[PDB]
Design an enzyme around this catalytic site. Structure first.
Site, PDB file in Angstrom:
ATOM      1  N   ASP A  34       6.998  -5.705   3.993  1.00  0.00           N
ATOM      2  CA  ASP A  34       7.091  -4.757   2.878  1.00  0.00           C
ATOM      3  C   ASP A  34       8.300  -4.931   1.963  1.00  0.00           C
ATOM      4  OD1 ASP A  34       6.996  -2.495   1.228  1.00  0.00           O
ATOM      5  OD2 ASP A  34       8.035  -1.251   2.734  1.00  0.00           O
ATOM      6  N   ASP A 230       6.109  -4.583  -4.773  1.00  0.00           N
ATOM      7  CA  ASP A 230       6.014  -3.924  -3.471  1.00  0.00           C
ATOM      8  C   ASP A 230       4.837  -4.413  -2.635  1.00  0.00           C
ATOM      9  OD1 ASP A 230       5.850  -2.194  -1.361  1.00  0.00           O
ATOM     10  OD2 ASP A 230       5.771  -0.348  -2.562  1.00  0.00           O
TER      11      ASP A 230
HETATM   12  C1  LIG Z   1      12.616   2.890  -0.049  1.00  0.00           C
HETATM   13  C2  LIG Z   1      11.556   3.706   0.690  1.00  0.00           C
HETATM   14  C3  LIG Z   1      12.231   4.881   1.404  1.00  0.00           C
HETATM   15  C4  LIG Z   1      10.486   4.168  -0.300  1.00  0.00           C
HETATM   16  N1  LIG Z   1       9.858   3.016  -0.969  1.00  0.00           N
HETATM   17  C5  LIG Z   1       8.397   3.080  -0.802  1.00  0.00           C
HETATM   18  O1  LIG Z   1       7.845   4.157  -0.564  1.00  0.00           O
HETATM   19  C6  LIG Z   1       7.670   1.960  -1.567  1.00  0.00           C
HETATM   20  N2  LIG Z   1       6.331   1.637  -1.051  1.00  0.00           N
HETATM   21  C7  LIG Z   1       6.424   1.105   0.318  1.00  0.00           C
HETATM   22  C8  LIG Z   1       5.438   1.764   1.288  1.00  0.00           C
HETATM   23  C9  LIG Z   1       5.547   1.120   2.675  1.00  0.00           C
HETATM   24  C10 LIG Z   1       4.547   1.562   3.540  1.00  0.00           C
HETATM   25  C11 LIG Z   1       4.180   2.904   3.566  1.00  0.00           C
HETATM   26  C12 LIG Z   1       3.131   3.328   4.374  1.00  0.00           C
HETATM   27  C13 LIG Z   1       2.448   2.423   5.179  1.00  0.00           C
HETATM   28  C14 LIG Z   1       2.818   1.083   5.161  1.00  0.00           C
HETATM   29  C15 LIG Z   1       3.860   0.657   4.342  1.00  0.00           C
HETATM   30  N3  LIG Z   1       4.043   1.690   0.831  1.00  0.00           N
HETATM   31  C16 LIG Z   1       3.496   2.699   0.139  1.00  0.00           C
HETATM   32  O2  LIG Z   1       4.139   3.690  -0.203  1.00  0.00           O
HETATM   33  C17 LIG Z   1       2.149   2.544  -0.178  1.00  0.00           C
HETATM   34  C18 LIG Z   1       1.321   1.964   0.777  1.00  0.00           C
HETATM   35  C19 LIG Z   1      -0.061   2.028   0.645  1.00  0.00           C
HETATM   36  C20 LIG Z   1      -0.882   1.336   1.528  1.00  0.00           C
HETATM   37  O3  LIG Z   1      -1.954   1.817   1.891  1.00  0.00           O
HETATM   38  N4  LIG Z   1      -0.365   0.227   2.075  1.00  0.00           N
HETATM   39  C21 LIG Z   1      -1.148  -0.576   3.027  1.00  0.00           C
HETATM   40  C22 LIG Z   1      -0.396  -0.696   4.354  1.00  0.00           C
HETATM   41  C23 LIG Z   1      -1.449  -1.838   2.519  1.00  0.00           C
HETATM   42  C24 LIG Z   1      -2.778  -2.217   2.372  1.00  0.00           C
HETATM   43  C25 LIG Z   1      -3.108  -3.408   1.727  1.00  0.00           C
HETATM   44  C26 LIG Z   1      -2.105  -4.227   1.223  1.00  0.00           C
HETATM   45  C27 LIG Z   1      -0.771  -3.855   1.374  1.00  0.00           C
HETATM   46  C28 LIG Z   1      -0.446  -2.670   2.028  1.00  0.00           C
HETATM   47  C29 LIG Z   1      -0.613   2.662  -0.464  1.00  0.00           C
HETATM   48  C30 LIG Z   1       0.194   3.212  -1.455  1.00  0.00           C
HETATM   49  N5  LIG Z   1      -0.372   3.977  -2.392  1.00  0.00           N
HETATM   50  C31 LIG Z   1       0.600   4.618  -3.290  1.00  0.00           C
HETATM   51  S1  LIG Z   1      -1.598   3.301  -3.254  1.00  0.00           S
HETATM   52  C32 LIG Z   1      -3.131   4.057  -2.752  1.00  0.00           C
HETATM   53  O4  LIG Z   1      -1.388   3.541  -4.750  1.00  0.00           O
HETATM   54  O5  LIG Z   1      -1.689   1.795  -2.994  1.00  0.00           O
HETATM   55  C33 LIG Z   1       1.576   3.178  -1.278  1.00  0.00           C
HETATM   56  C34 LIG Z   1       7.607   2.326  -3.058  1.00  0.00           C
HETATM   57  C35 LIG Z   1       6.439   3.261  -3.375  1.00  0.00           C
HETATM   58  O6  LIG Z   1       8.858   2.825  -3.548  1.00  0.00           O
END
Ligand SMILES: CC(C)CNC(=O)[C@@H](NC[C@H](Cc1ccccc1)NC(=O)c1cc(C(=O)N[C@H](C)c2ccccc2)cc(N(C)S(C)(=O)=O)c1)[C@@H](C)O
Ligand SMILES: NC(=O)[C@@H]1CCCN1
Length: 387
Positions: A34, A230
């Site tokens: 990630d 991301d």
């Molecule tokens: C720094 C940290 C505290 C905050 N940063 C994050 O939240 C970042 N994103 C990283 C997270 C990590 C993660 C969270 C939950 C499960 C697995 C990994 N990923 C997400 O927030 C994220 C994951 C997902 C997601 O389902 N990820 C899965 C595991 C995935 C599936 C297929 C390819 C890649 C990942 C979905 C979405 N949605 C917002 S969406 C419906 O628009 O795509 C966001 C960004 C949004 O700033």
């Protein structure tokens, strides 16, 4: 880097992960890659969706830091206990590193049933690690403790059609080359854009097109708040205004067929008879990014094969179904798996830049292919970045 080529497994909608071992004797775990975060964390107690988890009491090298940690993501959140232990990557460089590890004790909507991964590897910078920037991220420890170059590259491979659990387990889902670049993973030239700041892997988009037609917005709207790469996010996520305009344009380009509002909002799948998906009615989407050379930019273009994600609607159905994987954000642009599945992406931390090249495994048809092209210089740049 033949040794690391093909070291990832996974699927669209599920997550791409690499095998790692933690503790002594080594405990094997599948860790999600990630680039949208900076914490290394693994399940550490039983959970409905976890087949295995880290057992600290069985590691002779585990070191308890006696400190809690909380990590909330755009999707999902978890709570845990900090410690350090020895970590290795079976199909990565041959090194062992003592790294920070968040032992996950409680979580909510984080782990995904059937995903096959049990932890997450935050590859971004210390600035965003929880509790604070003093918790050294894994990649940082790796570079300080070894001679591995301060750079990694990623090739995430989507399939274009659904895969069951056995197929996903028996399939290559991509490559994560640690410390270098493997020419076999891409075709054409690698174009680099500046990492604007080292916190998220932040970049600046300067123009957006749908089938060559300019969205024509003030470029600040594209990076409103921020734009990041991301690998832990499924979708190409866009700021509300950009999203509404992009969707109005995609709808206009594909109007020979009408789809419910639920489709465009990602709430319902669309299906077509086996093999008849009309890829050609959907537009390609191009994002222009700032180049390294002043007043220069380049563009990366994806196909509907990247933004219409395959989903299995039952087991003996003779339909190819998909979900629209472009959605809105109130926290900037997020170039997730939808963008990454089309390109070989190089996170060149040493030179603070991200390179993009057409991926050797991106999904396409005989008429169109993903693309990375440039340079362009008619571009009205910077005032594009947000503050
Ligand atoms: C720094 C940290 C505290 C905050 N940063 C994050 O939240 C970042 N994103 C990283 C997270 C990590 C993660 C969270 C939950 C499960 C697995 C990994 N990923 C997400 O927030 C994220 C994951 C997902 C997601 O389902 N990820 C899965 C595991 C995935 C599936 C297929 C390819 C890649 C990942 C979905 C979405 N949605 C917002 S969406 C419906 O628009 O795509 C966001 C960004 C949004 O700033
Ligand atoms: N993501 C995967 O499982 C790859 C893509 C094609 C078949 N294996």
């Amino acid at each position: 880097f033949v040794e690391m080529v093909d070291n990832l497994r996974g699927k669209s909608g599920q997550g791409y992960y690499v095998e790692m071992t933690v503790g002594s004797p080594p405990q094997t775990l599948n860790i999600l890659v990630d680039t949208g975060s900076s914490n290394f964390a693994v399940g550490a107690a039983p959970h409905p969706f976890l087949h295995r988890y880290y057992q600290r009491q069985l590691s002779s090298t585990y070191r308890d830091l006696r400190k809690g940690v909380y990590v909330p993501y755009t999707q999902g959140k978890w709570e845990g206990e900090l410690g350090t232990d020895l970590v290795s990557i079976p199909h990565g460089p041959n090194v062992t590193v003592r790294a920070n590890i968040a032992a996950i004790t409680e979580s909510d909507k984080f782990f995904i049933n059937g995903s096959n991964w049990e932890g997450i590897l935050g590859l971004a910078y210390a600035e965003i690690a929880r509790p604070d920037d003093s918790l050294e991220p894994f990649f940082d420890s790796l570079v300080k403790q070894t001679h591995v170059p301060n750079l990694f590259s990623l090739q995430l491979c989507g399939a274009g059609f659904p895969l069951n659990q056995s197929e996903v387990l028996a399939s290559v889902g991509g490559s994560m080359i640690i410390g270098g670049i493997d020419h076999s993973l891409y075709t054409g030239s690698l174009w680099y854009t500046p990492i604007r700041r080292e916190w998220y892997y932040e970049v600046i988009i300067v123009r957006v097109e749908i089938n060559g037609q300019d969205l024509k917005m003030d470029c600040k709207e594209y990076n409103y708040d921020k734009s990041i790469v991301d690998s832990g996010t499924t979708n190409l996520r866009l700021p509300k205004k950009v999203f509404e305009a992009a969707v109005k344009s995609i709808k206009a380009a594909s109007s020979t067929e009408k789809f419910p509002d639920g489709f465009w909002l990602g709430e319902q799948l669309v299906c077509w008879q086996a093999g008849t998906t009309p890829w050609n009615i959907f537009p390609v989407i191009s994002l222009y990014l700032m180049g390294e050379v002043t007043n220069q930019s380049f563009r990366i273009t994806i196909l509907p094969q990247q933004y219409l994600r395959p989903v299995e609607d039952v087991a003996t159905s003779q339909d190819d179904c998909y979900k629209f994987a472009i959605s809105q954000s109130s926290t900037g642009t997020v170039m997730g798996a939808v963008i990454m599945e089309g390109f070989y992406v190089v996170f060149d931390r040493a030179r603070k830049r991200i390179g993009f090249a057409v991926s050797a495994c991106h999904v396409h048809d005989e008429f169109r292919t993903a693309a990375v092209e440039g340079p362009f210089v008619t571009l009205d740049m910077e005032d594009c970045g947000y503050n």
